[PDB]
Amino acid sequence: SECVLGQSKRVDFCGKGYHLMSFPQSAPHGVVFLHVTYVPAQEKNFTTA
Amino acid sequence: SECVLGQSKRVDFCGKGYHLMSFPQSAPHGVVFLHVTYVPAQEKNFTTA
C-alpha cells in the first residue's frame, strides 16, 4: 500500500536509498517486490559558509 | 532505522514534539534511544484575517 501505490519518505522502507518506485510480482505462498531506488555517486569537496 | 538514519515526520513516533535527532545506546539485552526534540514556549495573542 505504501511502496507501490505512491512514493515513500520513510528511510530504509522501500529499498536502500532514496525511493523511486516498486513493482510487485507474485510468488508461490508469497510476494516479491522490485524496488527502484536512487543512489549518489562520485563527489567533490568544496568550501562552504 | 527511521529516527537515527534521517528525520521523521510522524507524530509522537521519535519522541514527543517536533523531532530533531536521536542517539542510540546499548544496554544488556536491549537498546536505549535519546531523542532530541523541539518544543514551543511563551506565546501571545494576535488579530488575524
Distance from CA of B41 to the nearest CA of A (A): 29
- The H or E element containing residue B32 is strand B30-38
The verdict on a CB contact (< 8 Å) between B2 and A9 is no
* Single-letter amino acid, residue A46: F
Determine the Cα–Cα distance for residues B37 and B2; give it in Å rounded to an integer: 15
Sign of the alpha-carbon torsion through A1, A32, B3, A21: negative
Q: Residues with Cβ < 8 Å from B9, sequence gap 6 or more?
A: A9
Q: Residue holding cell 501571545?
A: B44
